[PDB]
Amino acid sequence: APAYTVKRADIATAIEDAVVNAANHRGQVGDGVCRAVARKWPQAFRNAATPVGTAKTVKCDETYIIHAVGPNFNNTSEAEGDRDLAAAYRAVAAEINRLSISSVAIPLLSTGIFSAGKDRVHQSLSHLLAAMDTTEARVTIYCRDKTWEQKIKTVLQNR
């Protein structure tokens, strides 16, 4: 069975078997919590593009890194947006079982440019957990080095 957890770091220097990333759509090096990963595993980004609402694993060397593409609410209808956000997390969850890892780090998708108002970990984390509960890996939630992580803790205890 999976289990939730929280860690205060950039989602890159994780130590779980697999590392999920808030990938843009185009697998390019880009803004926000993405670059951290690219510095360790640049080859994993190399043509790692995949459509909205999905996940694309690339093996850099001997790790499974999973690029999850969140929908941009700033350019989609809330129906499409919450749906494809769940789609992305579900595609991740599939790849978790698919590569069959025991532990994986996972950032709260819906930040920087995807949010367009959607700025509640509680919401994204609902769609994430609903999908990732279907796996049996550890579920180490990451965000950044900050008070946001504290909020994610309180939510994880409340939910």
Q: Where are the domains of the chain?
A: 1-159
Does 113 belong to an annotated binding site?
yes
Does 114 belong to an annotated binding site?
yes
Does 81 belong to an annotated binding site?
no
Rounding to the nearest 10 degrees, give the CA dihedral for residues 22, 26, 27, 29. -80
Give 126-133's long-range contacts (Cβ < 8 A, gap of 24+). 126/159, 127/82, 127/85, 127/86, 127/89, 128/89, 129/4, 129/159, 130/86, 130/89, 131/86, 131/89, 131/90, 131/92, 131/93, 132/2, 132/89, 132/92, 132/93, 132/96, 132/106, 133/2
Does 32 belong to an annotated binding site?
yes
The residue with tokens 């700025």 is: 119
| CATH 3.40.50.300 given to domain 1-159 | no
Q: How far is CA 16 from CA 20, 107, 122, 131, in A?
A: 10, 13, 23, 19
Tokens of 153: 């803790």
Rounding to the nearest 10 degrees, give the CA dihedral for residues 112, 60, 55, 36. -10
Does 11 belong to an annotated binding site?
no
